Amino acid sequence: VPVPVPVAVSGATTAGLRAQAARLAGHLRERPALGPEAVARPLLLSRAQRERRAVVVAADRDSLLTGLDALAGGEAGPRLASGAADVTGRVVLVFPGQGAHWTGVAERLWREAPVFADSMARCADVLRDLAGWELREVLVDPVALERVDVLQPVSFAVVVSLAALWASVGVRPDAVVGHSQGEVAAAHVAGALTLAEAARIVVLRSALIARELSGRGAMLTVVADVERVTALLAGFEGRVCVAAVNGPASVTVSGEDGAVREFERVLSARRMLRWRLPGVDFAGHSPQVDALRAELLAALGDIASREPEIPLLSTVTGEPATRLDAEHWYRNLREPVRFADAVTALLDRGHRVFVEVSPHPVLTTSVVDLAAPHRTAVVGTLRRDEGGLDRFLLSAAELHVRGVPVDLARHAGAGTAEV
Secondary structure (H helix, E strand, O other), X not given: OOXXXXXXXXXXXXXXXXXHHHHHHHHHHHOOOOOHHHHHHHHHHOOOOOOEEEEEEEOOHHHHHHHHHHHHOOOOOOXXXXXXXXXXXXXXXXXXXXXXXXXXXXXXXXHHOHHHHHHHHHHHHHHHHHHOOOHHHHOOOOOHHHOHHHHHHHHHHHHHHHHHHHHHOOOOOOEEEEOOOHHHHHHHHOOOOOHHHHHHHHHHHHHHHHHHOOOOOEEEEEOOOHHHHHHHOOOOOOOEEEEEEEEOOEEEEEEOHHHHHHHHHHHHHOOOOXXXXXXXXXXXXXXXXXXXXXXXXXXXXXXXXXXXXXXXEOOOOOOEOOOOOHHHHHHHHHOOEOHHHHHHHHHOOOEEEEEEXXXXXXXXXXXXXXXXXXXXXXXXXXXXXXXXXXXXXXXHHHHHOOOOOOOHHHXXXXXXXXX
16 A cells, blocks of 8 residues: 655746646656655755645555646645745644544554554553553444543544644644643643643543533534624523633533523524534533532542643633643633633734644634634644545645645655656
């Protein structure tokens, strides 16, 4: 099975970029034995990376030529990234909470990417001790993944391991922000928690949620701002509450299933878009969590933590995190998620590159909405049903083509074929 490589071309203008794509395709068609793996390395390392950039992520000739023909003709393609190399500024890793995971994700990437494999195995060791079960076996089990005590730690392992894979291509955070359970991953990646201690938090908290809350609630994300959602929650006081404010067009609410169903009818009649969070059968960030305060504080006990080595913008407060003690991890579940606030605080401090470290992008459109009108690069990592190294490399390419430093050459192979 051939391995995908990023094949880079660039020009001073869009028309120059398209001409370079045509020229490379022509050169390849004259030389039938020449593969992407022969030319990728010198195209990154021996050529200037100019103002208008593209990458085709391809494992074979035919797929490279398909991409290059599309690029030459000004069309989009599924393994083609292109852009203006005009983004400067500091880098944020964004860690999702619920609703991004898809059954089967991480298995293919474990096979294809040794840095990701390693991190996943390290996660498996810690989770084996804590939870008993075997991480790699659960990845592909749709029944196990509908249990909150399995999904949350699996989700944590995958996002932590994707962050490690980003780091291996030189994409490291200047700051991190984690939405809901993502805050635990963010804290670990920032150096405030060991892998073991972060895993223990997620494992203990998710098991408690499953024992006490699962089956007693639901969560719903709505395409609207919090002012509008708050107006529509008139008459739902203490039945459906705001659980997250993600952006000007993304707000999540939480409550008992029936009550949330009643609110969906309110939305439906007004032609408003909304969806239940996949993997969530409980009312996060609601008064239902109050009961899970005493047992959580006891189970967690004293948290082993230290000062984060880079800024951690909490979605509990919307500000730089203070003490990450048991009470913080309680409030991480009880209090509404202040995601928009945290992202806005980073935008106001010169952050312009946002990498969602997720199986599928769930917060990128909110980051984009918040970032306007600044020049910013906003990317995810994987997508639903696209868990290969090829999808990872396309996300890395999406950064490259906006002028963000990333070591694509790490995965470009050992080719020496010129021009």
